[PDB]
């Protein structure tokens, strides 16, 4: 066939091919002329050089070419990756991990010179000779081609014989060939399609071979292209063969970070431009306006079909989510059910860009800016799966912390390996000559044998030990022993699709008429009849082990000779089934015998799907233990031969399993019973479907399609009829009546359930539904009639009973003839048997035998941890084992496959016990690093400053890191029929690694190295951050007294003072904290994580108090200073130093004026004090001036001052511009490091130095009084200076994570952690990743840790906390509550009453604010919403209006000042919006009439009755008062439509008209645009109706509130025939309560209201309010009760209020002056809130007006007065801000009785929220309530 015809949809004759090795094997089998390259090399080594290739698809393909060439012709050709270039750090880390090029450069522009920088920073010379070169997508771009010309300088100089490019179709290719001809290179570009070379991806890219000119009269590129376009072979395997399974540890992890990321967390764009296009499409294809995949409301309110990765759908945008709906509807109406056909959408493209509904097996182009969507999974294409569509093989990949966008970059800007391999092989073949052969074979072969002979010894001597005890022989027949296992299986199997392969989902729900289990969170759109799940859950980790003990490992089949089958068919011939044919029988029996004979099935893995299953791989078949809940069994499947066409008669008949083994429930053994064969014998039978029952909307109708699928009916039952014998031959008695289960989803919502019948009593339930084939035309999909409905996987087949014809679908007909087909007849077989089967293994089982034989500089050797011996068959054996000598196996590139073929051995071994605890030699030699296990990272140089790196040290660091001992070593051999493989850990290497990462100190301590090994380690799915708890400080004895202070210590500061004394004393305590640096190494598949650690004990005196303002931290620290006085406990000293006995405090600037005044207030005069503010005090006093001083306190700005650093460098003997920086980053840290190295020498030399620096000399004590304030520049200052004891004081301790705890511990002196920049948050990583050298940013991606190595550091941080960190946080005081409740005055109460129902009418909750382009659509929003003024949401406005009456608070130009006078403005302004509505409705009708006439100028609609017009039918229906219109609402529509244009007829031109058409032209654009105008007009009609209905309601209630003759007259307008009466909240419909309760229940009042009404709306007219009762007119009733309460307090207390609304606070502050309660408002100034709070707390102003979110001590304050409940989103944040401020007043240090007051309104949303808070807060956290007592005071 032609290539285009073939690649449009996959050829059925090309064999299915998905293995990249088989791809390239076939490609080499194509051309046999490639050996000419072997010859023209003559023993040389080919020289490749890629540039910006991305993922080295070149080298992947070329390795596979070399392996293929050897496989066919027995000829070896080698090639040496001379150098690669790549710019992006994560890309080059990926390359270095997965390939290890010997040279890897930064940028191509540099490499036109004699040397360049490699990725590391080595600056090696450019190589100079290559043979083939490949540039890429990223370099071909005087600025545009900065890279392209830079690469051309390389090409011109070095003249490579072959050059290949790769890029998009739309590139300046002619200019490329011009630039090539500039330097004499023959170039020809051609475009080629990825789908044309073996892969079902669709990508077209443009290539061009190059070669130097004048090689011949021939033009080489033309012949090259002719050969390349010959190398075409279309796709034949669906993209479902390149996809990983859904429950796969790399995909389920991808689902889990999505859920976890959502668990941590607003950006609203308007898609109004494309919205009209979406509805236009829905209108055009006649699709409905439904949303059947995910019913989406807003950005993130959607709800998928429970199996659809819903946490991804929540994160998309509205356009994408809607386009998914439009796609599923287009794919519907074509007989195709999306979600059950395997296909893929790329939904980033706008609507109508693509035709869509393409060939299902194919996949669109996966551009870097893609948002793909796998249909049948319900989720995005995982990046690892986008890399396998580029031909890259993904098994042995190393990925370390890549995003999905960062990895989509790689997968999109890649080279399809088959395509580049074809281009290379044609290029090399055509340009085979002109190659500069070496042709010296034997001198090279000698070196080849030299390298092999030296490494064959090197691997054999790497293992020491093996004298450790061998352990008892294991037999593979561990069949050691009933249905308790089979029900442990049910209790352990999967219950929520989101569970995966080891997960527990709370609140499982199980259905009836079908057993579909799902979690309560992700379940309910395909909802169907649930009930909670009964059974309790066993962990699968615990189950699987009991299962493993039940299983053999190698099994074989005994029976099934030939000619036994030849009598198996005889009995079925005697029986009524019949044998259809003999050709198929021969072709089947043949391939069955070569699958059974000579095959030892080996155990591979266990599937934890909703049913547990075990899998056994052979050479030519597979075996599966199914372990069903009912009828567990074994099924055998035979692999069809690899070289078979897709439409093969053999391959087809070898698709379903071929043999069956019913596990005997009686028998306690797994393997037992008879074997039944599925003989291939297709059968023709005739059936009679009958449709009876109620008719239901069809599947398409339920989706809401509007074409011929507008309304279509299908039956609710189906009565199936089969012939007697034609029933008896089939095993299951399948004739009955099947009830449809529409809520129970399936393909086309088709789940029919068998009714319970007779004699099928104990048997699984049989379902009948539709199941598509994941590929192929709609007419492929059929009815399954099966016994299971589980969501299967690729390569798993459904065990079905009989299939039905493919032309049934659905209907509503009475009965019809249909053809059923069944093809597999099972027949008994007793001759089959399944049979299980001097092995050893050297478990060391002696943790000390290794430790004894361990020696220093033994890093070269691998201490043997395990050995084994197992009998294999040397025949039909595979090449992992090596005959004769140990072969090592490189784990990084072969470990997954290796350990996947050894699992049948590895899962009989016992777990390595005796190794969990760690013990080893002690007092080890310190600082003796290996410099082979742990190289010294190079010194980084600094010089607008760029982090430069030292090239010379970089090269040694490179070589050393390249040559490091692999911590685990695996070796295998097959000497004589007995395979022996061993595992060894390089323990001393781990210890040497951990030794290096532990910085040296001048300590008299010696570390101890140790090591441990833990089995069973499993990779960890994400959990949330661990919170860090601080221990209390009350359980200890209290220090007696300070014997100096004049004031007591309140009995809760004594218990902490004793704690500060005991540590600065440090009784006993050879060492306090043990700093532990661990290093690890993973052996994944076996599961061992072997970790070795170094411990250093350190003894340090001090801690962090971490206590909040209003606590006597200052008092307690002056106490600790007084106690240890004249007591010279600190022993050590630098040999040259100026140590004093003073103590130092570091405090911020505005808190320094405090501290000496508290010594003065307290004892004072018992020790000399010096405070220093400002630099010109350090100049003032010398060293002997500063002498004889006990306590010194410094402002933090002294370090931030730069004359301080000038003095520091002057005493450091540095140049005067050294240490002179304005940014204070990592560079200034080195400027400190060198200086501090200088200080020790300077002070070692040699007083009264006039201007000393604090950093030069040593203290008795340093106290960091605030640790979170100290800026990033001045923190480094306070981290250096030395002291005998270390104290940190802080109101807020920075204890949020490890990176925050480490900042404290560095001040302490501990070294609990090391930097890695892979542990912080995504935010925090960036602020440090801007300071990284370009090589460090690369080194971060190179190595990654285990998420257990972080948890252990978390544990060590917690252990640091529990020793050095205390916190005093438990009822201090009587905390009483006083719920004050309002009566509604109805002077402003009714003002409130109109708001909630006005907002109910307009149904607007919040003001949305987004990007509006349409000037006449955005203003209609800014005006409609304008009534909810000065606020964000309905709750906020309702609270503001229940606190105080006012239309709106931002505009103070007009002031109501009274309740009725405010109602006046309410009525006036609301009539104003009514007129605004009618006048927007004015201009809109005119524009509609004009656009209507725009059809008329063109002339009719091409027919008198071409179509009904939306606008026309809206007229003459909105133009009468007949029906579907308010009693009085619509009479005001005629007054506005007729005045423009009268009766329906004519009036084509408008009476005023400015622009007849805003308007290229389509004549359908304006048509459907007029339709949109009709819809908008209907909308506007609705708001008019609401506006007038609410107006009538409010004027009615204001009538009673006025209480006059009009009130009584319209009171007697009851209209209910009666004359106590309730009012409708929607309009004035005063009809009596007696009938009107039934009116509101029946949802229809007596009138011709107009809209349905709720019984909760009703109010009693006598219950509205009484007038003249209380003067609630001057201000809000809340404000006057506030005045009353604050009057009622005694004058001597203190009051604070919160004011949760700052807008309301402006009015509250003014109204408080009416009560004349002098107040502070906490505003009016910036940064002068310090004086705000110093006021009235130094001693005046009583009451404070807080903000409820705007560290200060409120100890003077006694009464909190909340003034209305706070409005907030989450209960967590509610309680956080609620216990906070409840904490601000009575935290500690208070000698009062705290009272909490609430001013709430009885009939108001404020109580509606208060009840919601109370009735839910007591359940969660079991929050402690406070006693409630009525405030009587004064
Ligand atoms: Zn779920
Ligand atoms: Zn159900
Ligand atoms: Zn070492
Ligand atoms: Zn009545
Ligand atoms: Zn009414």
XYZ file of C-alpha atoms in Angstrom, residues 387 717 922:
3
model
C 8.909 9.759 26.985
C -36.101 -4.673 30.964
C 34.382 3.409 68.296
